[PDB]
Amino acid sequence: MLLEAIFHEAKGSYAYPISETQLRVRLRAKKGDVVRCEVLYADRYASPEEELAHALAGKAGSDERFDYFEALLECSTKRVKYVFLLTGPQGEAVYFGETGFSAERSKAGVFQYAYIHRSEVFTTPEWAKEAVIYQIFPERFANGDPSNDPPGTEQWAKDARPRHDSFYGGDLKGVIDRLPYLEELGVTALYFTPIFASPSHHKYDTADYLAIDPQFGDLPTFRRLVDEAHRRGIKIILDAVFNHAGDQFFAFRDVLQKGEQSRYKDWFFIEDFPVSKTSRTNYETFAVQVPAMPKLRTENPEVKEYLFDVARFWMEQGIDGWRLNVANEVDHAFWREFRRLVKSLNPDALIVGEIWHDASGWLMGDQFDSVMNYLFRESVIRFFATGEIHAERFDAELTRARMLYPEQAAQGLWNLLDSHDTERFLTSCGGNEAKFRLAVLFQMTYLGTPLIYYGDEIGMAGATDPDCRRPMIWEEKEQNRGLFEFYKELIRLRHRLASLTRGNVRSWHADKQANLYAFVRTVQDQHVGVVLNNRGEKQTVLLQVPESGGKTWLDCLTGEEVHGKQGQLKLTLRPYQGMILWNGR
Amino acid sequence: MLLEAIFHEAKGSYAYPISETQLRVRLRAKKGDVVRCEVLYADRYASPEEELAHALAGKAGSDERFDYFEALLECSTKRVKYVFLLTGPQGEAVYFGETGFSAERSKAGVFQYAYIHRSEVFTTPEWAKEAVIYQIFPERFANGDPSNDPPGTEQWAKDARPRHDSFYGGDLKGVIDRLPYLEELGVTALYFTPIFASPSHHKYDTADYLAIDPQFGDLPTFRRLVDEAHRRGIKIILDAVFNHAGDQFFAFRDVLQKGEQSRYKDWFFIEDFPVSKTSRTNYETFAVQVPAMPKLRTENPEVKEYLFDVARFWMEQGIDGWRLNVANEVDHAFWREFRRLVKSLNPDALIVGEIWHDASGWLMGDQFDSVMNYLFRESVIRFFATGEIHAERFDAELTRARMLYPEQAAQGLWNLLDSHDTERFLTSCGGNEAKFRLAVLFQMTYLGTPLIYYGDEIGMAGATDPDCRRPMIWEEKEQNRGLFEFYKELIRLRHRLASLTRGNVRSWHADKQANLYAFVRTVQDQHVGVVLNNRGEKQTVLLQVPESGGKTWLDCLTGEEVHGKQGQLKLTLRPYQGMILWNGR
Numbered sequence A, B: 001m002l003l004e005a006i007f008h009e010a011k012g013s014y015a016y017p018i019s020e021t022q023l024r025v026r027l028r029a030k031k032g033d034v035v036r037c038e039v040l041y042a043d044r045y046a047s048p049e050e051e052l053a054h055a056l057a058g059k060a061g062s063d064e065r066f067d068y069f070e071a072l073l074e075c076s077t078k079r080v081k082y083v084f085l086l087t088g089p090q091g092e093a094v095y096f097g098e099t100g101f102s103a104e105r106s107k108a109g110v111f112q113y114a115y116i117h118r119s120e121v122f123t124t125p126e127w128a129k130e131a132v133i134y135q136i137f138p139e140r141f142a143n144g145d146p147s148n149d150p151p152g153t154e155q156w157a158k159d160a161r162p163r164h165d166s167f168y169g170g171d172l173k174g175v176i177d178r179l180p181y182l183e184e185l186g187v188t189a190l191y192f193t194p195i196f197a198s199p200s201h202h203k204y205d206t207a208d209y210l211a212i213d214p215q216f217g218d219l220p221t222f223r224r225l226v227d228e229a230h231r232r233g234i235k236i237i238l239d240a241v242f243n244h245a246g247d248q249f250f251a252f253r254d255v256l257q258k259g260e261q262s263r264y265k266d267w268f269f270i271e272d273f274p275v276s277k278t279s280r281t282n283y284e285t286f287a288v289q290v291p292a293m294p295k296l297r298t299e300n301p302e303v304k305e306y307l308f309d310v311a312r313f314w315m316e317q318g319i320d321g322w323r324l325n326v327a328n329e330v331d332h333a334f335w336r337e338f339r340r341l342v343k344s345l346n347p348d349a350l351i352v353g354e355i356w357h358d359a360s361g362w363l364m365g366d367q368f369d370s371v372m373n374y375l376f377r378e379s380v381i382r383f384f385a386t387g388e389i390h391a392e393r394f395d396a397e398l399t400r401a402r403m404l405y406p407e408q409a410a411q412g413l414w415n416l417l418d419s420h421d422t423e424r425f426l427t428s429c430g431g432n433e434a435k436f437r438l439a440v441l442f443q444m445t446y447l448g449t450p451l452i453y454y455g456d457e458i459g460m461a462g463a464t465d466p467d468c469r470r471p472m473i474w475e476e477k478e479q480n481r482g483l484f485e486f487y488k489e490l491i492r493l494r495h496r497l498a499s500l501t502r503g504n505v506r507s508w509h510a511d512k513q514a515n516l517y518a519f520v521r522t523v524q525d526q527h528v529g530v531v532l533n534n535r536g537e538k539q540t541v542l543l544q545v546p547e548s549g550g551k552t553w554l555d556c557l558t559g560e561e562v563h564g565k566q567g568q569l570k571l572t573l574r575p576y577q578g579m580i581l582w583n584g585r
């Protein structure tokens, strides 16, 4: 075996508790190098002559180059020291501990997980595990009150082609009027892009954090929305824009006016005074030269105090969580304290960070509960949309991503197909509905929480910002109702099958030539196998009956009954068809 | 190129800032696999049309299986995305990024270090880097006041054999009396084990955190000690026992008397009432069944404020830092807040955690400045004391350990040979002074902060606790004055050669056959090469002139001049001899 390929660390995503007395440990090795991985462990103060406890680590996954083994250690003392015993195909064995590798156990040393503090066990809101999120970009969802429309509003039509400065009149009253639709779809939570006072259509350049934007409504209307959504079983998630403010933010205007004499100058990153001349900003902003968005110095206790108050105010209005804008450019201390504040006010309030890359640094349990899973989007884009990768590469990317974070984070990642910052997924699929649907079926059955971008469910299309922000299509005749009913069925099944929301996930089959991919979701005695024929050709495949699942399966999408023949299942898939096989338990 | 052996993560010790605009990045590959490692980077919002910046990563080290490449990225924007370009021996070129490996750069993706916040740049007290610490176990150092001696105090003699419950009368007045001695040795800081009220001789079972133990003195005496040490250029570090209290601690006494009625019952981990009764404890304690040490629930905000108050009190007395007892069993939040409290009170107060294993989780910059480096001791024991490993594995263990933490931590790690919890190092060497001295020579020249265990400098020996806590030997005739003078010279040298305190470290030469180990310390134009002949036979060797060090060298220990012919130095080392070759700059 290739020892240079073996990896483990007593922290992060390779060692973490799932309870106050149980520790999950993972180990990585070159694919095929290790057939048996066992963990020998004991209390960190156990005597030299005490027997070590044993825990066998099953193979939890494999990507292109590695195998990932996982075990559960029962640590009643909450203190554990442990070593791995790795066995190869030829029976060659070796111990792997903190000191290194050795045939002699004592020489390998022991990894140590010092202490398991209850306060450090990653815990997330129970409801977030089985939620189906629907993203609403207010200015474009529904114009329920044209009397608050901004001047110059354009026509709310299917042929609308938004500009960076277009307005259509979307508002909160509209959202309220359309709740019956959202409820019928099966949505359980709504994520809103900024809704606080701001001059733009997107409103990421905040003028006033404590006020609902006039064109969207007022506090009484917001409160009504929260109540109407809640009694319909729908939660509310707001967009927290704490990385930067708008240039109309009071503190910033003060600096613009008083400059060096401003009591708020240290609330930002001003390069020199006066504050500006044009787009040539002499102050740090979001991205590059974005005059309307001066970066906030969240490291300043005054700024942190202010934003924390903003958070308190809105949570008082009854919201259920936050979506953190550009979360990765706000300091960690801020986020650790934010989590403490939020959870103290509402233990069930969800915290989702908006980060597009590897977000492990914010997903260990003391900061966010989840993140906008763009890694998931990329793999889904490449596999179902552009066809840039095949099923085996898809399986690998998913597996590698799953191993990036502790299971508590993975279980609730917001798996989106697109957002208000990307082209519509149907457009990514070049308008191919068959491909789009397969992606959706995957999104609705995979490990994580699905996030639906408004309109995708009724066939909307579009290029990237601002063309992805076109007015919602409400005209029944202009909506893809077949797709809508498709979504409804998938969402109902998700709520219907426990393994789909709370089950683990394991690869079942991945064939690069047939481009068929299958995985199994498991919890308790229930097993649900999802098979995706990601090819424009009808195919048949023989899959091994999933580990301890039973001999009778039912494709919940068709009512088709399939029996295990000599430990196998014969499946015939039409082009781009997906099956959701329930083992009946 | 074995891709399965290549590793990098955009955080931890593989990617971290050394300043507000500079990110240090490290990458490891199978030893020999990569000949050139380059980093191509840019601002995270740079246009796809902009050209990437270039940074060549030199080989910063190599262990038994890997090569470690290190580079410095200039990030004026404080936001960076990057990809590695690795070239094999044959000229093979592969790109490595967050997405994976590929001959095509774009397909490799890019790692991202979202933002560099000034508050997250690991910063340590400037003085700690060039310090030489002396550890004082007060009950056994010096009895300056015989009137405060504990009951049954035993004879202060060289033939003393301490028992777990012995007392010899050591106190703070004695330390004050021996300051001229400590100053002569050249020590710059004193690390004291517990000195607060406690009934034991070690005092890790705290009765009163706010009072000097009567056997050791009183507050005024402590203050005088602080002042007398300070005026002699000696700082003071106290032992903070925050993981557990003594069973005579006021809060615990209360729980013992009032039980479930006690307002302090949640300050501990009580399983049932009434509490205690012999060694069969019904409450969690340090280690296993240690009735005198009930664990403190530092997660409890009341417990945390009390301890923080304890820390504020002693810092008001003028101390310079803390040594955190069993730091790995106290929660991370407590430690993050502790650091902010401490640093706000005294920016130069040092925080050293007592952790015996990989302490990377506490050394990223938001918790401890350093730790008692027991990993260093293990390597030193195996190589110099037991001879269990040869020069090449020694070099490997050292390099591997060095790569475990960011450079800010490594530079000030407390490198000890032994402690009040281990057998004396001389005893580890089986009484061999030649091996002992070579280890000390290594300790005084290697990267990190040397920690001297009281008595080792004058030849004390002893088995592990309690035998390693023998009363100090003060009678000159019973002291190894030759050793003492050796220590003095090495300490002076360390203070005189900037590279020994502020320089980096790189392997120079390691040969298992001759068991010769050499490394070089470098800062600016100063290069100091250390050659250790760890064998009991006179030997001669040839070493390539230290990279860009120059051609004139001087062994500071003897005054011997070495010129080096054709880029090589000819060295003749006596048995267990060591050389400290200064390049003259």
Ligand SMILES: OC[C@H]1O[C@H](O[C@H]2[C@H](O)[C@@H](O)[C@@H](O[C@H]3[C@H](O)[C@@H](O)[C@@H](O[C@H]4[C@H](O)[C@@H](O)[C@@H](O[C@H]5[C@H](O)[C@@H](O)[C@@H](O[C@H]6[C@H](O)[C@@H](O)[C@H](O)O[C@@H]6CO)O[C@@H]5CO)O[C@@H]4CO)O[C@@H]3CO)O[C@@H]2CO)[C@H](O)[C@@H](O)[C@@H]1O
Residues within 6 Å of the ligand: A164, A202, A204, A286, A290, A325, A326, A327, A354, A355, A356, A357, A374, A378, A420, A421, A465, A466, B045
């Ligand atoms: O010409 C300037 C610009 O102006 C307008 O943009 C404004 C926008 O309309 C408005 O809504 C707002 O934008 C906010 C946005 O809505 C929020 O969701 C958020 O979005 C920003 C992200 O938070 C931020 O991280 C970044 O995103 C970049 C990723 O970080 C980066 O990783 C990369 O993504 C790639 C991944 O790295 C890779 O792993 C994966 O495979 O591929 C990804 C790319 O496909 O690149 C991302 C894009 O830079 O920027 C996001 C903003 O776009 O915060 C925003 C700010 O509040 O304000 C905007 C500024 O005024 C126009 O609409 C826009 O077209 C125009 O470019």
Ligand SMILES: OC[C@H]1O[C@H](O[C@H]2[C@H](O)[C@@H](O)[C@@H](O[C@H]3[C@H](O)[C@@H](O)[C@@H](O[C@H]4[C@H](O)[C@@H](O)[C@@H](O[C@H]5[C@H](O)[C@@H](O)[C@@H](O[C@H]6[C@H](O)[C@@H](O)[C@H](O)O[C@@H]6CO)O[C@@H]5CO)O[C@@H]4CO)O[C@@H]3CO)O[C@@H]2CO)[C@H](O)[C@@H](O)[C@@H]1O
Residues within 6 Å of the ligand: A044, A045, B164, B202, B204, B286, B290, B325, B326, B327, B354, B356, B357, B374, B375, B378, B420, B421, B465, B466
């Ligand atoms: O039966 C009674 C008991 O009495 C004595 O113990 C008491 C001791 O005399 C007294 O001073 C005090 O002890 C404290 C000690 O002085 C402090 O420094 C500290 O020490 C404890 C450590 O903090 C704690 O982590 C642990 O140490 C363990 C290491 O974590 C663990 O890694 C492992 O160490 C190995 C290293 O990893 C490796 O690098 C090296 O090569 O080999 C090591 C050996 O395995 O094991 C360590 C031992 O478990 O315990 C330390 C305590 O010894 O905190 C202490 C508590 O405040 O109180 C003691 C209890 O009353 C005797 O000394 C003891 O033998 C006897 O059993």
Ligand SMILES: [Ca+2]
Residues within 6 Å of the ligand: A143, A144, A145, A146, A147, A148, A149, A169, A170, A171, A215
């Ligand atoms: Ca309107």
Ligand SMILES: [Ca+2]
Residues within 6 Å of the ligand: B143, B144, B145, B146, B147, B148, B149, B169, B170, B171, B215
């Ligand atoms: Ca005394």
